Design an enzyme around this catalytic site. Sequence first.
Site, PDB file in Angstrom:
ATOM      1  CG  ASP A   1      41.872  44.476  37.918  1.00 17.69           C
ATOM      2  OD1 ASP A   1      41.282  43.584  37.282  1.00 17.69           O
ATOM      3  OD2 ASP A   1      41.213  45.302  38.570  1.00 17.69           O
ATOM      4  N   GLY A   2      42.825  45.942  40.702  1.00 16.12           N
ATOM      5  CA  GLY A   2      42.721  45.792  42.157  1.00 16.12           C
ATOM      6  C   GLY A   2      41.374  45.139  42.466  1.00 16.12           C
TER       7      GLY A   2
ATOM      8  CD  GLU B   1      38.487  49.404  40.884  1.00 17.90           C
ATOM      9  OE1 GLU B   1      37.626  48.649  41.387  1.00 17.90           O
ATOM     10  OE2 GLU B   1      38.218  50.485  40.345  1.00 17.90           O
TER      11      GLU B   1
ATOM     12  CG  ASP C   1      39.215  46.223  34.380  1.00 19.82           C
ATOM     13  OD1 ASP C   1      39.620  46.717  35.447  1.00 19.82           O
ATOM     14  OD2 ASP C   1      38.769  45.041  34.350  1.00 19.82           O
TER      15      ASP C   1
ATOM     16  CG  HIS D   1      39.254  39.788  32.433  1.00 20.33           C
ATOM     17  ND1 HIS D   1      38.894  38.943  33.458  1.00 20.33           N
ATOM     18  CD2 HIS D   1      39.723  40.923  33.016  1.00 20.33           C
ATOM     19  CE1 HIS D   1      39.155  39.502  34.622  1.00 20.33           C
ATOM     20  NE2 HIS D   1      39.657  40.690  34.372  1.00 20.33           N
TER      21      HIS D   1
ATOM     22  CG  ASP E   1      40.625  39.980  37.967  1.00 21.84           C
ATOM     23  OD1 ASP E   1      40.313  40.750  38.879  1.00 21.84           O
ATOM     24  OD2 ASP E   1      40.055  38.918  37.691  1.00 21.84           O
TER      25      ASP E   1
END
EC number: 3.1.26.4
Length: 152
Positions: free
Chosen positions: A8-9, A46, A68, A122, A132
Site C-alpha cells: 500500500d502507499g 502505491e 487495493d 480493508h 496501509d
Amino acid sequence: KQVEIFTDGSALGNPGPGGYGAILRYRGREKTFSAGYTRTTNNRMELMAAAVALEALKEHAEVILSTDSQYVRQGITQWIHNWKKRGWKTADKKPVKNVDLWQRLDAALGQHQIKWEWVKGHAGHPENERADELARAAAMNPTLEDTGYQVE
C-alpha cells in the site's frame, strides 16, 4: 514455496509527504519494508510499494501480490502493454506520468510469475490494512526524496 506480498502507499497531499508499506511472507515468515518521502503522491507511493516489494526477491519466484491500488491495477491490466508499444508516451508525445516508477515496476515483474490479487476494502484483508498503517506511519516521518516526482 510461494511468496505472498501485500502493498500500500499513501500521501498527505497532492503533492505532500507520503510513504509505502510492503509485507512479504514466505515459508511462514515475514519481512516488512516501509519508507517515507518528503513530497510525493498517493499514486506514486502505491506504485513504489509494489516495485520495492518485487525488488527484495533475488531470484525467480512464484508470487501472489495483493494490492487495493486501482492505479496499479489499471497499469497492469490495461496500460503498460499499450504504453510499451507507443514508446512510453501518451498521444501528445509526452512521457507517461510516473514513467520512472512504471519502468521500475515493469523490470521487477518480468523476472517472476505473479498472480495479482486486486483487493477492494480493508475488511477481511488484514495484511493490506497493516500495509496501509505502515504507509501512513512513514508519511508522518519522511526521510527520503522522491526524485522522480514532477508537478502535473
